[PDB]
Coordinates of C-alpha atoms in Angstrom, one line a residue:
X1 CA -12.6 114.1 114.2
X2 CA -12.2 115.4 110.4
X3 CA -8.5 115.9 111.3
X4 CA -6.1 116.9 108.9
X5 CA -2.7 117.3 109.5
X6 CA -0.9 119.5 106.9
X7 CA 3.3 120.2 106.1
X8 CA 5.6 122.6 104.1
X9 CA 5.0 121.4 100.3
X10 CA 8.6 121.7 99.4
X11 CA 12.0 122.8 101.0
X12 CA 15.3 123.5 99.3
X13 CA 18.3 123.0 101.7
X14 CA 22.3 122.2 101.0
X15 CA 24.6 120.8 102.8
X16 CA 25.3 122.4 106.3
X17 CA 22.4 124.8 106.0
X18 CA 19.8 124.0 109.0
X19 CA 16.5 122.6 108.2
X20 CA 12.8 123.5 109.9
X21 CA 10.2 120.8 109.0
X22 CA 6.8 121.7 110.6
X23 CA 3.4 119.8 110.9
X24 CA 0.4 121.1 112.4
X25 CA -3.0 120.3 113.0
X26 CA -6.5 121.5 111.8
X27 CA -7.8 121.5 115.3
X28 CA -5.3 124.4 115.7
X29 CA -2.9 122.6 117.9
X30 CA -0.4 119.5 118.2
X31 CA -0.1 118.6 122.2
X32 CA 1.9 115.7 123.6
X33 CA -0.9 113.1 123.3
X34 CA -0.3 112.7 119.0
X35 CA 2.7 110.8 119.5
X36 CA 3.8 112.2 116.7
X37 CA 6.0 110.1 114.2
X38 CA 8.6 111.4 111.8
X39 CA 9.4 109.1 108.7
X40 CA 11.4 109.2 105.6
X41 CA 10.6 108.2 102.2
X42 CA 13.3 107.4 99.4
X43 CA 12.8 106.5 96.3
X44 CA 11.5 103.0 95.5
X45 CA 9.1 103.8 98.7
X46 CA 11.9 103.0 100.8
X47 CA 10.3 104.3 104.3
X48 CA 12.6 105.0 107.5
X49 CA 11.5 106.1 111.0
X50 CA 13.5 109.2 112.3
X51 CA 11.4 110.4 115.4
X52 CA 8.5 109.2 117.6
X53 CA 6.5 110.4 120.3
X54 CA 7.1 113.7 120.0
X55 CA 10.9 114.1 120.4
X56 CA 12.6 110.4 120.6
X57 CA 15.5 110.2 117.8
X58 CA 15.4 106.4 117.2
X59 CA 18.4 104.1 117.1
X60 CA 20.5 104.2 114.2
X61 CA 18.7 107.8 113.3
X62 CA 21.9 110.1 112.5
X63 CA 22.4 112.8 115.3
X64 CA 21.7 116.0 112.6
X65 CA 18.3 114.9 113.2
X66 CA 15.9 116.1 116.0
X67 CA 12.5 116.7 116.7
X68 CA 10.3 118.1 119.4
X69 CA 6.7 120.2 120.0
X70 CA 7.8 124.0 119.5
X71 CA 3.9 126.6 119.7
X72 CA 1.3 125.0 118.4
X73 CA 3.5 122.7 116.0
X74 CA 5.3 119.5 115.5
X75 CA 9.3 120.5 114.2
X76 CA 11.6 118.0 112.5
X77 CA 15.3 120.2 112.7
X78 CA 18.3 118.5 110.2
X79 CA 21.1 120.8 111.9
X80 CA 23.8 120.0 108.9
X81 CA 21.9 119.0 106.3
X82 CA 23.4 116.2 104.2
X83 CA 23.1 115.4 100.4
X84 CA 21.5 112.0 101.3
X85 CA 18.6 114.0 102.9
X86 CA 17.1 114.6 99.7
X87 CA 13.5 112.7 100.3
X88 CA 10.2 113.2 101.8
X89 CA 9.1 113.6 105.3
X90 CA 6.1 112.5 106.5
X91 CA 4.7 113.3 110.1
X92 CA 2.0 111.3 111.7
X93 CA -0.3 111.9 114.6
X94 CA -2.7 109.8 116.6
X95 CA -6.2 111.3 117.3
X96 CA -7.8 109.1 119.9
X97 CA -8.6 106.2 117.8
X98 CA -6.3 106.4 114.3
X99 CA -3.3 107.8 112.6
X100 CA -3.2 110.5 110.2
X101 CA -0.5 111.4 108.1
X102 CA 0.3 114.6 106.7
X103 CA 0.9 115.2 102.9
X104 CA 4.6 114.9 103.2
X105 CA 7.2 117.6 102.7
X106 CA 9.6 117.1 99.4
X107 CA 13.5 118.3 100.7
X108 CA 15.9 118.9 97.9
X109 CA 19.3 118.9 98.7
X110 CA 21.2 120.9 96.4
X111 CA 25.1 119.8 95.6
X112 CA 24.0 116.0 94.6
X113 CA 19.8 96.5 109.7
X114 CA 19.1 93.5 112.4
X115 CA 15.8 94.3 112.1
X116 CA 14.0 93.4 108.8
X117 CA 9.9 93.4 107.9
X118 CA 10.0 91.0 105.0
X119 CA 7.0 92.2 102.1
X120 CA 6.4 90.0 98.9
X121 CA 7.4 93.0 96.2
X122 CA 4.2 92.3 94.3
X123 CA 1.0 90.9 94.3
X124 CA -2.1 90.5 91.4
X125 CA -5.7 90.0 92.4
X126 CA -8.9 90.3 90.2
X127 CA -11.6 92.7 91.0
X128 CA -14.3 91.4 93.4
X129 CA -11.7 88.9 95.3
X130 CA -10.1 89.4 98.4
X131 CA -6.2 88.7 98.4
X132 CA -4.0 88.1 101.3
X133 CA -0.7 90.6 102.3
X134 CA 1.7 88.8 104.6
X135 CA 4.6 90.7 106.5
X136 CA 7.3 88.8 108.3
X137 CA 9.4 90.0 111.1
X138 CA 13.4 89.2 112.0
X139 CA 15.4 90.6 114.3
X140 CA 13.3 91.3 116.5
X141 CA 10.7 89.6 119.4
X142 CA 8.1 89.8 117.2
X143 CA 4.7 89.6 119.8
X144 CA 6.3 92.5 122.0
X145 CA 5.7 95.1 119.1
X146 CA 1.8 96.0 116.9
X147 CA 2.5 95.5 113.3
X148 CA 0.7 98.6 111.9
X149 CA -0.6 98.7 108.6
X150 CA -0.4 101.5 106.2
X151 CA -0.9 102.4 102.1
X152 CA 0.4 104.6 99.9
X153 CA -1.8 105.3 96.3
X154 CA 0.1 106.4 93.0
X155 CA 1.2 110.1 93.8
X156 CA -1.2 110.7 97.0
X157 CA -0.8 110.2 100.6
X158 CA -0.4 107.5 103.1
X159 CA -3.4 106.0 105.2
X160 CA -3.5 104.4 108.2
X161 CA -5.4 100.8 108.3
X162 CA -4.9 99.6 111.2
X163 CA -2.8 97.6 113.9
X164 CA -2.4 94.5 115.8
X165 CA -1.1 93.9 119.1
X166 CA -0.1 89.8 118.6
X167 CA 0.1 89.0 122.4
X168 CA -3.4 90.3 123.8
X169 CA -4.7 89.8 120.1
X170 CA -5.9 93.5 121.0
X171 CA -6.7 94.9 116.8
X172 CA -7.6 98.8 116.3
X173 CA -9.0 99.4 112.5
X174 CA -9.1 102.8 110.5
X175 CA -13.2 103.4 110.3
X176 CA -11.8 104.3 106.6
X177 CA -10.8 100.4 106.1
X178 CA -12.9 98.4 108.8
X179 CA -15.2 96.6 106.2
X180 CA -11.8 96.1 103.8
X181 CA -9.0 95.0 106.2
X182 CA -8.7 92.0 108.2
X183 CA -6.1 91.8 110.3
X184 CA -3.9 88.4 112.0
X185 CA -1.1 87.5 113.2
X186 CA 0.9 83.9 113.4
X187 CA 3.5 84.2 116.2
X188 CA 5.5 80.9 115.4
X189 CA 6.4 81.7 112.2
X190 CA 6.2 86.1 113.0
X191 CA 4.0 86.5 110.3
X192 CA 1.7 89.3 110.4
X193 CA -1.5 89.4 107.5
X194 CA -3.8 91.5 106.3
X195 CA -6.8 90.6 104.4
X196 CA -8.0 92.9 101.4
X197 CA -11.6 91.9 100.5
X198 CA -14.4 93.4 97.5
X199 CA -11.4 94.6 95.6
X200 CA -11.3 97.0 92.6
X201 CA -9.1 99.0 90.9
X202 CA -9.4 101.9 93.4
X203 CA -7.2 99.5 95.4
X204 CA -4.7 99.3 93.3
X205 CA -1.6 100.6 95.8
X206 CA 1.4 99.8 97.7
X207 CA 0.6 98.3 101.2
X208 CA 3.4 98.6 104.1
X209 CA 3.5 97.2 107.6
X210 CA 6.1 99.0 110.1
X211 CA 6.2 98.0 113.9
X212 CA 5.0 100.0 116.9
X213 CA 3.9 99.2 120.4
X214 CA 2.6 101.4 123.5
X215 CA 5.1 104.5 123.9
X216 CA 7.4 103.0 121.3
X217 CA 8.3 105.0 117.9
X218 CA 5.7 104.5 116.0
X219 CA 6.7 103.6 112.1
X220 CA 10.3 102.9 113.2
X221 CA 11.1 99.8 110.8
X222 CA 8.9 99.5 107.7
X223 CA 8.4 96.3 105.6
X224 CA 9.3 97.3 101.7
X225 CA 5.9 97.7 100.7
X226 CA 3.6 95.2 98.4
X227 CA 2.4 96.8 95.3
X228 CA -1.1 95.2 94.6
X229 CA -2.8 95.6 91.3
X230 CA -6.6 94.7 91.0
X231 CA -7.2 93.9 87.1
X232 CA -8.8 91.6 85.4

């Protein structure tokens, strides 16, 4: 409904110290059908997967790193925390028909690929245009897996847009962006695109795809996000 899913503001860890991120839910309860997502943000918005649905560590994800439903929470654990740690953890939920994120927990850390979604760095449109985002995937079998869609405004939150299944051509759009995202695909080249129209300044942003698919971990591999700027 109006969910919002909300996360520590800030933990200060060092290295060996165990770590309890939490992420709960304004309907009073995260249960096993959120699918919840853990990702990690670096600087540069450099965006890694560490858990999904629930409690899957994925591949490559360091073993200091678990997550599972504990009460009426979400819990990311980092059992031996490391200095490279230090970033911003994100947990995401699916309420029947969308993602939300929650505002992201900042970890300080004191004591300081095969697969690849390819994301032009930059792109300039002029208010009232539309502009095209492409996002190409290697490594991978690009139809089995959704390309989701998400964006990340200066100094805010992430939103979900939306995401495409390429082999039943199945799309599911945010009601926040149905009227401003368009989403395809191209399978011969494993292209996925999104579509910005009526644009103004407001979407000024960085836009990322990362891959999913039905009981997958959602958000594993993210694209390096295209920072648009609408101006004149």
């Amino acid at each position: 409904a109006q969910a919002v899913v909300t996360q520590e503001s800030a933990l200060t860890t060092s290295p060996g110290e165990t770590v309890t991120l939490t992420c709960r839910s304004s309907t009073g309860a995260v249960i096993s059908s959120n699918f919840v997502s853990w990702v990690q943000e670096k600087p540069d918005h450099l965006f890694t997967g560490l858990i999904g649905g629930n409690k899957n560590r994925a591949p490559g994800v360091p073993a200091r790193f678990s997550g599972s439903l504990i009460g009426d929470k979400a819990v990311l654990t980092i059992t031996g925390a490391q200095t490279e740690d230090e970033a911003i953890y994100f947990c995401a939920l699916w309420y029947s028909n969308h993602w939300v994120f929650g505002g992201g927990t900042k970890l300080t850390v004191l004591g300081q690929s095969q697969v690849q979604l390819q994301q032009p760095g930059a792109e300039l449109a002029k208010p009232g245009a539309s502009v095209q985002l492409s996002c190409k995937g290697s490594g991978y079998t690009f139809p089995n897996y959704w390309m989701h869609w998400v964006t990340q405004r200066p100094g805010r939150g992430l939103e979900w847009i939306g995401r495409i299944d390429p082999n039943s051509g199945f799309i599911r759009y945010d009601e926040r962006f149905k009227t401003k995202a368009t989403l395809t695909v191209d399978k011969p080249s494993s292209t996925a695109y999104m579509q910005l129209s009526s644009l103004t300044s407001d979407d000024s942003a960085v836009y990322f795809c990362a891959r999913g698919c039905y009981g997958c971990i959602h958000f594993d591999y993210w694209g390096q996000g295209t920072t648009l700027t609408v101006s004149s």
